[PDB]
Write a protein that binds this ligand. Structure first.
Ligand SMILES: COc1cc(Nc2c(C#N)cnc3cc(OCCCN4CCN(C)CC4)c(OC)cc23)c(Cl)cc1Cl
Length: 266
């Protein structure tokens, strides 16, 4: 046991937020004062330090644009205790009521924050393995954080967000996260629309290997789709860094699209 462990008696499992093939997610209260969120094991569901190795990644990672670990439980019943994100998933946020008021400036800045989280990941020498809008939590003031490193690792599988070399040959790198970041960029600019519309997994895998790439989403600037294309380069090592992507997006509206005017959607 380590210093990340707490008494479970500390924990008010209150409202329910979701389920899965893993367990649940709950709003709750920690030591009576603190709002938290808990990813649960409903008793047996799966392996101990499989559920509890997303902790071992999340313990050593610690950035403002990453969802924060608060504590863990193995005094079974079992829990992963984390920082509570008020507006839920970026996917739900984009599809929901506020989604449609979202404009490029907002969307680019969300992209930015995420780039920022991932750039930290990048210099910590970790890989996320599952980057996509569904694993981005939104809080107040349009804040976005990376969450659910649930497969993550030191650099020692829903394929539409997955880089070819990673889906096919299991080559997961920060460079394959980048690939996913570019796909994540199509989600933001379409307001949550599933990538590769009308295509099934195997068809996506076959067309992407022949070099098919998603075209510029409607009302999305060419400069922003260029960036997605860079993120989707065949050779992993030619994809840009999260550091370049972070700085590119923060500076976007001055350095890159300094003449942008809003349309009916973006
Ligand atoms: C702890 O373990 C993990 C937990 C999570 N999941 C969450 C964490 C975290 N972290 C924090 N806070 C969350 C808040 C949620 O909903 C709150 C508000 C929802 N509404 C949207 C619609 N409007 C109009 C009302 C508000 C939520 O919904 C499912 C999931 C959350 C992930 Cl993604 C990964 C890991 Cl590893």
């Amino acid at each position: 046991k380590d210093a990340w462990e707490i008494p479970r008696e500390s924990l008010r499992l209150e409202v329910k937020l979701g389920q899965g093939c893993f367990g649940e997610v709950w709003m709750g209260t920690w030591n009576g004062t603190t709002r938290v969120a808990i990813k649960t094991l409903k008793p047996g569901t799966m392996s101990p330090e499989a559920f509890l190795q997303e902790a071992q990644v999340l313990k050593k990672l610690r950035h403002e644009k990453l969802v924060q670990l608060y504590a863990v439980v193995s005094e079974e019943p079992i829990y992963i205790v984390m920082e509570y994100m008020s507006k839920g998933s970026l996917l739900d946020f984009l599809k929901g009521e506020t989604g449609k008021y979202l404009r490029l400036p907002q969307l680019v800045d969300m992209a930015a924050q995420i780039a920022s989280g991932m750039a930290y990941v990048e210099r910590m020498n970790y890989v996320h393995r599952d980057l996509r809008a569904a694993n981005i939590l939104v809080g107040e003031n349009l804040v976005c954080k990376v969450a659910d490193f649930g497969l993550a690792r030191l650099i020692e599988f829903p394929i539409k967000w997955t880089a070819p070399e990673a889906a096919l040959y299991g080559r997961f790198t920060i460079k394959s996260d980048v690939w996913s970041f570019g796909i994540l960029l199509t989600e933001l600019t379409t307001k949550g629309r599933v990538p590769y519309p009308g295509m099934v997994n195997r068809e996506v895998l076959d067309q992407v290997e022949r070099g098919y790439r998603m075209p510029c989403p409607p009302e999305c600037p060419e400069s922003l789709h260029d960036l997605m294309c860079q993120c989707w380069r065949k050779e992993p090592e030619e994809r840009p860094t999260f550091e370049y992507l972070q700085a590119f997006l923060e500076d976007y509206f001055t350095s890159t699209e300094p003449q942008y005017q809003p349309g009916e959607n973006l």
